[PDB]
mmCIF file of C-alpha atoms in Angstrom:
data_model
loop_
_atom_site.group_PDB
_atom_site.id
_atom_site.type_symbol
_atom_site.label_atom_id
_atom_site.label_comp_id
_atom_site.label_asym_id
_atom_site.label_seq_id
_atom_site.Cartn_x
_atom_site.Cartn_y
_atom_site.Cartn_z
ATOM 1 C CA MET A 1 24.278 3.981 -15.704
ATOM 2 C CA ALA A 2 23.515 7.324 -17.306
ATOM 3 C CA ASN A 3 25.420 10.245 -15.810
ATOM 4 C CA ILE A 4 22.265 11.922 -14.487
ATOM 5 C CA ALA A 5 21.396 8.759 -12.553
ATOM 6 C CA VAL A 6 24.932 8.192 -11.232
ATOM 7 C CA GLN A 7 25.229 11.792 -10.040
ATOM 8 C CA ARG A 8 21.800 11.732 -8.380
ATOM 9 C CA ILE A 9 22.406 8.462 -6.529
ATOM 10 C CA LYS A 10 25.892 9.561 -5.475
ATOM 11 C CA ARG A 11 24.545 12.856 -4.116
ATOM 12 C CA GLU A 12 21.553 11.199 -2.436
ATOM 13 C CA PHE A 13 23.647 8.406 -0.901
ATOM 14 C CA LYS A 14 25.940 10.943 0.763
ATOM 15 C CA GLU A 15 23.021 13.120 1.898
ATOM 16 C CA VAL A 16 21.611 10.152 3.814
ATOM 17 C CA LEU A 17 25.027 9.383 5.320
ATOM 18 C CA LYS A 18 25.390 12.928 6.690
ATOM 19 C CA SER A 19 21.713 13.446 7.554
ATOM 20 C CA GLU A 20 20.351 14.223 11.008
ATOM 21 C CA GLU A 21 18.157 11.127 10.733
ATOM 22 C CA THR A 22 21.139 8.804 10.239
ATOM 23 C CA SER A 23 22.948 10.333 13.231
ATOM 24 C CA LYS A 24 19.854 9.568 15.333
ATOM 25 C CA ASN A 25 19.794 6.034 13.840
ATOM 26 C CA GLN A 26 16.416 6.624 12.205
ATOM 27 C CA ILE A 27 17.459 5.679 8.654
ATOM 28 C CA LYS A 28 20.496 4.172 6.952
ATOM 29 C CA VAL A 29 21.565 3.178 3.444
ATOM 30 C CA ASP A 30 24.455 0.978 2.341
ATOM 31 C CA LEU A 31 25.937 -0.214 -0.924
ATOM 32 C CA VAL A 32 25.462 -3.718 -2.294
ATOM 33 C CA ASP A 33 27.090 -3.731 -5.738
ATOM 34 C CA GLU A 34 29.574 -1.293 -7.269
ATOM 35 C CA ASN A 35 27.464 0.584 -9.873
ATOM 36 C CA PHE A 36 24.938 1.981 -7.332
ATOM 37 C CA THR A 37 21.998 0.062 -8.845
ATOM 38 C CA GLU A 38 21.113 -2.023 -5.768
ATOM 39 C CA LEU A 39 21.184 -0.562 -2.265
ATOM 40 C CA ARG A 40 20.233 -1.836 1.185
ATOM 41 C CA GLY A 41 18.081 0.439 3.315
ATOM 42 C CA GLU A 42 17.207 0.371 6.990
ATOM 43 C CA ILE A 43 14.626 2.296 9.004
ATOM 44 C CA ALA A 44 13.714 2.279 12.672
ATOM 45 C CA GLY A 45 10.151 1.659 13.738
ATOM 46 C CA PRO A 46 8.587 5.011 14.557
ATOM 47 C CA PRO A 47 7.938 5.783 18.229
ATOM 48 C CA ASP A 48 4.446 5.199 19.634
ATOM 49 C CA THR A 49 3.719 2.517 17.013
ATOM 50 C CA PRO A 50 3.760 -1.294 17.347
ATOM 51 C CA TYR A 51 7.006 -1.219 15.323
ATOM 52 C CA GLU A 52 8.847 0.761 18.018
ATOM 53 C CA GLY A 53 12.276 -0.629 18.861
ATOM 54 C CA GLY A 54 12.372 -2.643 15.645
ATOM 55 C CA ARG A 55 14.695 -2.155 12.697
ATOM 56 C CA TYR A 56 13.584 -2.975 9.156
ATOM 57 C CA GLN A 57 15.869 -3.674 6.212
ATOM 58 C CA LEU A 58 14.872 -2.570 2.734
ATOM 59 C CA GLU A 59 15.803 -3.883 -0.695
ATOM 60 C CA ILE A 60 16.231 -0.894 -3.030
ATOM 61 C CA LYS A 61 16.687 -1.175 -6.807
ATOM 62 C CA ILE A 62 17.484 1.999 -8.752
ATOM 63 C CA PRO A 63 16.085 1.970 -12.318
ATOM 64 C CA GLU A 64 18.074 3.023 -15.367
ATOM 65 C CA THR A 65 15.549 5.874 -15.791
ATOM 66 C CA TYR A 66 16.299 7.407 -12.379
ATOM 67 C CA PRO A 67 15.404 10.082 -11.252
ATOM 68 C CA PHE A 68 12.360 10.113 -13.542
ATOM 69 C CA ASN A 69 11.004 6.800 -12.202
ATOM 70 C CA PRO A 70 10.906 5.733 -8.551
ATOM 71 C CA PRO A 71 13.201 3.171 -6.949
ATOM 72 C CA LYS A 72 11.725 -0.278 -6.504
ATOM 73 C CA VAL A 73 11.604 -0.953 -2.755
ATOM 74 C CA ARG A 74 10.670 -4.105 -0.833
ATOM 75 C CA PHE A 75 10.725 -4.986 2.858
ATOM 76 C CA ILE A 76 13.349 -7.637 3.551
ATOM 77 C CA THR A 77 12.310 -7.696 7.202
ATOM 78 C CA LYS A 78 8.850 -9.213 7.612
ATOM 79 C CA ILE A 79 6.231 -6.821 8.974
ATOM 80 C CA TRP A 80 2.515 -6.789 9.835
ATOM 81 C CA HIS A 81 1.055 -3.708 8.095
ATOM 82 C CA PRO A 82 -1.989 -3.103 5.835
ATOM 83 C CA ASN A 83 0.175 -1.545 3.084
ATOM 84 C CA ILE A 84 3.022 -4.117 3.101
ATOM 85 C CA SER A 85 2.616 -7.766 2.107
ATOM 86 C CA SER A 86 3.203 -9.937 5.169
ATOM 87 C CA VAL A 87 4.513 -12.584 2.732
ATOM 88 C CA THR A 88 6.731 -10.797 0.190
ATOM 89 C CA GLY A 89 7.376 -7.349 1.665
ATOM 90 C CA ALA A 90 5.924 -5.592 -1.375
ATOM 91 C CA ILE A 91 4.883 -2.010 -0.676
ATOM 92 C CA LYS A 92 1.717 -0.149 -1.678
ATOM 93 C CA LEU A 93 2.599 3.560 -1.506
ATOM 94 C CA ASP A 94 1.823 6.243 -4.082
ATOM 95 C CA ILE A 95 5.289 7.822 -4.259
ATOM 96 C CA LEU A 96 6.653 4.447 -5.377
ATOM 97 C CA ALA A 97 4.000 4.421 -8.142
ATOM 98 C CA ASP A 98 2.094 7.265 -9.827
ATOM 99 C CA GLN A 99 3.014 10.005 -7.309
ATOM 100 C CA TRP A 100 6.771 9.796 -7.785
ATOM 101 C CA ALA A 101 8.368 13.167 -8.497
ATOM 102 C CA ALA A 102 11.894 13.620 -9.837
ATOM 103 C CA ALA A 103 12.707 15.944 -6.929
ATOM 104 C CA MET A 104 12.319 13.060 -4.457
ATOM 105 C CA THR A 105 15.423 11.357 -3.057
ATOM 106 C CA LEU A 106 16.521 8.251 -1.183
ATOM 107 C CA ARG A 107 16.200 10.260 2.033
ATOM 108 C CA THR A 108 12.564 11.251 1.492
ATOM 109 C CA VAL A 109 11.679 7.729 0.322
ATOM 110 C CA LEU A 110 13.106 6.301 3.543
ATOM 111 C CA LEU A 111 11.339 8.936 5.650
ATOM 112 C CA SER A 112 8.093 8.340 3.736
ATOM 113 C CA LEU A 113 8.233 4.624 4.508
ATOM 114 C CA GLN A 114 8.719 5.485 8.178
ATOM 115 C CA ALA A 115 5.643 7.719 7.971
ATOM 116 C CA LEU A 116 3.694 4.875 6.332
ATOM 117 C CA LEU A 117 4.519 2.620 9.282
ATOM 118 C CA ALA A 118 3.097 5.231 11.668
ATOM 119 C CA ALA A 119 -0.058 5.935 9.584
ATOM 120 C CA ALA A 120 -1.458 3.030 7.572
ATOM 121 C CA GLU A 121 -4.039 3.440 4.792
ATOM 122 C CA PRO A 122 -6.148 0.273 5.158
ATOM 123 C CA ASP A 123 -8.537 1.301 2.357
ATOM 124 C CA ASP A 124 -5.646 1.043 -0.141
ATOM 125 C CA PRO A 125 -4.163 -2.220 1.118
ATOM 126 C CA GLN A 126 -1.372 -4.435 -0.046
ATOM 127 C CA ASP A 127 -2.319 -7.237 2.389
ATOM 128 C CA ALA A 128 -6.102 -7.698 2.524
ATOM 129 C CA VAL A 129 -5.872 -10.010 5.552
ATOM 130 C CA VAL A 130 -3.837 -7.504 7.579
ATOM 131 C CA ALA A 131 -5.962 -4.541 6.464
ATOM 132 C CA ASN A 132 -9.140 -6.380 7.469
ATOM 133 C CA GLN A 133 -7.700 -7.110 10.924
ATOM 134 C CA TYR A 134 -6.566 -3.481 11.213
ATOM 135 C CA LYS A 135 -10.108 -2.226 10.571
ATOM 136 C CA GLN A 136 -12.150 -4.903 12.369
ATOM 137 C CA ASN A 137 -10.002 -5.314 15.514
ATOM 138 C CA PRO A 138 -7.486 -2.473 15.999
ATOM 139 C CA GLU A 139 -6.230 -3.851 19.323
ATOM 140 C CA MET A 140 -5.598 -7.312 17.879
ATOM 141 C CA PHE A 141 -3.748 -5.713 14.959
ATOM 142 C CA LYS A 142 -1.619 -3.658 17.344
ATOM 143 C CA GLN A 143 -0.569 -6.654 19.441
ATOM 144 C CA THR A 144 0.007 -8.805 16.351
ATOM 145 C CA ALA A 145 2.169 -6.078 14.818
ATOM 146 C CA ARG A 146 4.057 -5.807 18.111
ATOM 147 C CA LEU A 147 4.591 -9.581 18.032
ATOM 148 C CA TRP A 148 5.942 -9.477 14.482
ATOM 149 C CA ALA A 149 8.198 -6.541 15.384
ATOM 150 C CA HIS A 150 9.595 -8.596 18.269
ATOM 151 C CA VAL A 151 10.024 -11.859 16.358
ATOM 152 C CA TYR A 152 11.350 -10.499 13.040
ATOM 153 C CA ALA A 153 12.661 -6.964 13.676
ATOM 154 C CA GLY A 154 14.404 -7.216 17.060
ATOM 155 C CA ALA A 155 11.836 -5.221 19.039
ATOM 156 C CA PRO A 156 11.221 -5.859 22.764
ATOM 157 C CA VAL A 157 9.097 -8.759 23.962
ATOM 158 C CA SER A 158 5.441 -8.703 22.927
ATOM 159 C CA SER A 159 2.279 -9.429 24.890
ATOM 160 C CA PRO A 160 2.092 -12.605 27.021
ATOM 161 C CA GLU A 161 -1.523 -13.504 26.160
ATOM 162 C CA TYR A 162 -0.482 -14.045 22.538
ATOM 163 C CA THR A 163 2.635 -16.014 23.502
ATOM 164 C CA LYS A 164 0.424 -18.487 25.388
ATOM 165 C CA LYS A 165 -1.491 -19.379 22.220
ATOM 166 C CA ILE A 166 1.824 -19.702 20.360
ATOM 167 C CA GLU A 167 3.142 -22.150 22.965
ATOM 168 C CA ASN A 168 -0.041 -24.240 22.850
ATOM 169 C CA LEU A 169 0.369 -24.853 19.114
ATOM 170 C CA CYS A 170 4.138 -25.336 19.388
ATOM 171 C CA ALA A 171 3.401 -27.954 22.058
ATOM 172 C CA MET A 172 1.536 -29.794 19.276
ATOM 173 C CA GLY A 173 4.832 -30.188 17.400
ATOM 174 C CA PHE A 174 4.422 -27.365 14.881
ATOM 175 C CA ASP A 175 7.182 -24.996 13.802
ATOM 176 C CA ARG A 176 7.162 -21.776 15.817
ATOM 177 C CA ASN A 177 7.379 -19.522 12.752
ATOM 178 C CA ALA A 178 4.493 -21.270 10.982
ATOM 179 C CA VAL A 179 2.459 -21.115 14.197
ATOM 180 C CA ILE A 180 2.967 -17.348 14.313
ATOM 181 C CA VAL A 181 1.941 -16.865 10.672
ATOM 182 C CA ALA A 182 -1.097 -19.123 11.094
ATOM 183 C CA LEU A 183 -2.344 -17.513 14.309
ATOM 184 C CA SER A 184 -1.686 -14.025 12.934
ATOM 185 C CA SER A 185 -3.470 -14.851 9.676
ATOM 186 C CA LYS A 186 -6.454 -16.483 11.406
ATOM 187 C CA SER A 187 -6.840 -13.575 13.877
ATOM 188 C CA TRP A 188 -5.779 -15.820 16.772
ATOM 189 C CA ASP A 189 -8.575 -18.363 16.390
ATOM 190 C CA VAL A 190 -6.799 -21.447 17.738
ATOM 191 C CA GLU A 191 -9.067 -23.870 15.875
ATOM 192 C CA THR A 192 -8.761 -22.458 12.349
ATOM 193 C CA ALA A 193 -5.036 -21.916 12.910
ATOM 194 C CA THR A 194 -4.712 -25.575 13.912
ATOM 195 C CA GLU A 195 -6.601 -26.702 10.795
ATOM 196 C CA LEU A 196 -4.376 -24.527 8.600
ATOM 197 C CA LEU A 197 -1.279 -25.988 10.265
ATOM 198 C CA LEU A 198 -2.660 -29.529 9.931
ATOM 199 C CA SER A 199 -2.981 -28.979 6.158
ATOM 200 C CA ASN A 200 0.420 -27.354 5.482
ATOM 201 C CA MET B 1 -29.874 13.167 -26.083
ATOM 202 C CA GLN B 2 -30.016 14.194 -22.428
ATOM 203 C CA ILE B 3 -29.038 11.904 -19.552
ATOM 204 C CA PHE B 4 -28.604 12.523 -15.836
ATOM 205 C CA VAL B 5 -25.775 11.522 -13.501
ATOM 206 C CA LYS B 6 -26.502 11.413 -9.766
ATOM 207 C CA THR B 7 -23.737 12.235 -7.296
ATOM 208 C CA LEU B 8 -22.925 11.893 -3.610
ATOM 209 C CA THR B 9 -23.862 15.510 -2.898
ATOM 210 C CA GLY B 10 -27.341 15.434 -4.458
ATOM 211 C CA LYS B 11 -26.213 17.750 -7.275
ATOM 212 C CA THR B 12 -27.251 16.055 -10.517
ATOM 213 C CA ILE B 13 -24.988 16.367 -13.558
ATOM 214 C CA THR B 14 -26.866 16.853 -16.835
ATOM 215 C CA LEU B 15 -25.107 15.618 -19.975
ATOM 216 C CA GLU B 16 -25.730 15.754 -23.718
ATOM 217 C CA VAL B 17 -24.689 12.426 -25.251
ATOM 218 C CA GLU B 18 -25.279 10.116 -28.203
ATOM 219 C CA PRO B 19 -26.357 6.454 -27.951
ATOM 220 C CA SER B 20 -23.051 5.487 -29.603
ATOM 221 C CA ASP B 21 -20.945 7.365 -27.028
ATOM 222 C CA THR B 22 -18.721 5.090 -24.969
ATOM 223 C CA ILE B 23 -18.558 5.025 -21.180
ATOM 224 C CA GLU B 24 -15.065 6.493 -21.527
ATOM 225 C CA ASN B 25 -16.556 9.345 -23.562
ATOM 226 C CA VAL B 26 -19.179 9.911 -20.855
ATOM 227 C CA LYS B 27 -16.428 10.099 -18.234
ATOM 228 C CA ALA B 28 -14.584 12.638 -20.393
ATOM 229 C CA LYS B 29 -17.729 14.778 -20.598
ATOM 230 C CA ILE B 30 -18.050 14.609 -16.806
ATOM 231 C CA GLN B 31 -14.467 15.850 -16.424
ATOM 232 C CA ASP B 32 -15.250 18.819 -18.675
ATOM 233 C CA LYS B 33 -18.365 19.725 -16.673
ATOM 234 C CA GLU B 34 -17.188 18.952 -13.130
ATOM 235 C CA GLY B 35 -13.379 18.631 -13.166
ATOM 236 C CA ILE B 36 -13.416 15.015 -11.938
ATOM 237 C CA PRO B 37 -10.638 12.922 -13.549
ATOM 238 C CA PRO B 38 -11.989 9.849 -15.367
ATOM 239 C CA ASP B 39 -9.756 7.478 -13.375
ATOM 240 C CA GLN B 40 -11.680 8.403 -10.201
ATOM 241 C CA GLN B 41 -15.075 7.844 -11.867
ATOM 242 C CA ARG B 42 -17.256 4.755 -11.451
ATOM 243 C CA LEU B 43 -20.494 4.678 -13.447
ATOM 244 C CA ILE B 44 -23.398 2.540 -12.217
ATOM 245 C CA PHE B 45 -26.483 1.605 -14.218
ATOM 246 C CA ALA B 46 -28.998 -1.212 -13.698
ATOM 247 C CA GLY B 47 -27.145 -2.148 -10.510
ATOM 248 C CA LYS B 48 -23.849 -2.876 -12.291
ATOM 249 C CA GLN B 49 -20.729 -0.903 -13.167
ATOM 250 C CA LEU B 50 -20.352 0.001 -16.842
ATOM 251 C CA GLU B 51 -16.998 -0.621 -18.521
ATOM 252 C CA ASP B 52 -15.237 2.164 -20.381
ATOM 253 C CA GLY B 53 -15.097 0.578 -23.840
ATOM 254 C CA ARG B 54 -18.820 -0.081 -24.328
ATOM 255 C CA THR B 55 -21.455 2.341 -25.585
ATOM 256 C CA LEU B 56 -24.592 3.672 -23.915
ATOM 257 C CA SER B 57 -26.726 1.790 -26.444
ATOM 258 C CA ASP B 58 -25.015 -1.439 -25.350
ATOM 259 C CA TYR B 59 -26.490 -0.956 -21.854
ATOM 260 C CA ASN B 60 -29.927 0.143 -23.164
ATOM 261 C CA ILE B 61 -29.362 3.636 -21.746
ATOM 262 C CA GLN B 62 -31.858 5.935 -23.473
ATOM 263 C CA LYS B 63 -33.095 9.518 -23.200
ATOM 264 C CA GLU B 64 -33.415 10.868 -19.637
ATOM 265 C CA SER B 65 -31.903 7.755 -18.066
ATOM 266 C CA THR B 66 -30.032 8.246 -14.794
ATOM 267 C CA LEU B 67 -26.517 6.994 -14.133
ATOM 268 C CA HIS B 68 -24.903 6.910 -10.705
ATOM 269 C CA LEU B 69 -21.446 8.406 -10.209
ATOM 270 C CA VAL B 70 -19.372 6.817 -7.444
ATOM 271 C CA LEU B 71 -16.219 8.852 -6.830
ATOM 272 C CA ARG B 72 -13.072 6.957 -5.856
ATOM 273 C CA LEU B 73 -9.807 5.683 -7.260
ATOM 274 C CA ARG B 74 -6.758 7.298 -5.618
ATOM 275 C CA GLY B 75 -5.165 3.852 -5.681
ATOM 276 C CA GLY B 76 -1.651 4.467 -4.434
#
C-alpha cells in the first residue's frame, strides 16, 4: 500500500491496542494478512442494551485510498438491529459512507459502531423487517435482539416465553437456527413462521 | 414566470423560473434562496414526485403553479 495508508493503519492499530477501551475489553482489533489490508475487529455489546454481554466480530477491509475513504466494515457475528442486515451483516452508518472524514481512525469507527448498537436509527434502515419490528413493537424487538445476542454472540440466556415457541417448532423437526430466523422474521407468529419453514 | 413552493413551516418560497427549467434547476434555485441542499429536496406536483432531469413544461407546470417541498434525505 501507499506509505500514507501504511503509516496510518500502523499508528491506528497500535492506538487501539494501547487504548483504555481495549483494556476494559470494549473493543479489539487483530491482523489477518500481512499488508494490513484486512483486519478483524471485535466490540462488546454496550451496557443497558439487548446486546449486553455479547461480543461481535467485524470484518474490516482497508481501501488503497485510506485515509481518504472509509474502511469497509461488515458484521461477521449475526445481530438483530435496524441498521445492520440480519442476513449479511452489512452496515448502514454515515461515517462508513458520505460522512467519513480523514481524521477518523479504527478506534473511532469501532466506538461509533458500539454507539450505533446502543442508539438505532430505524428511519434509515439497513434491514426493513428489523426496523419495522423496532418501531411497531419495541418490546418484541428488545427480546428478539436479546435472543440473537444469546444465540450468536455469547450473551446470557434470553427470555423463556420466546424459547417456548422455538421448542414448539423444533419439536416439528425443523432446524433450530432456521426456526429462530423464521420466528424472528415473522414477529413470532407461529403460523406464518411454520408456513415459511414448510416452504424452505 | 413565477411559481410557488409550499413548505412544512407555512412559509412559501417564490421562484422565478422558465418552462424549460429542469427540476434539478428548480432545486438549485431553492438552495440559493433558502440554503437547502438539493439532495434533501423532494418536489411534489399533481400528487407525484418530479424527477430531476425533466422540465417544468413536461409536467404542465405553468405560471403561478404551486409545488410542494418535502424536506428529507440524510440517508446515512
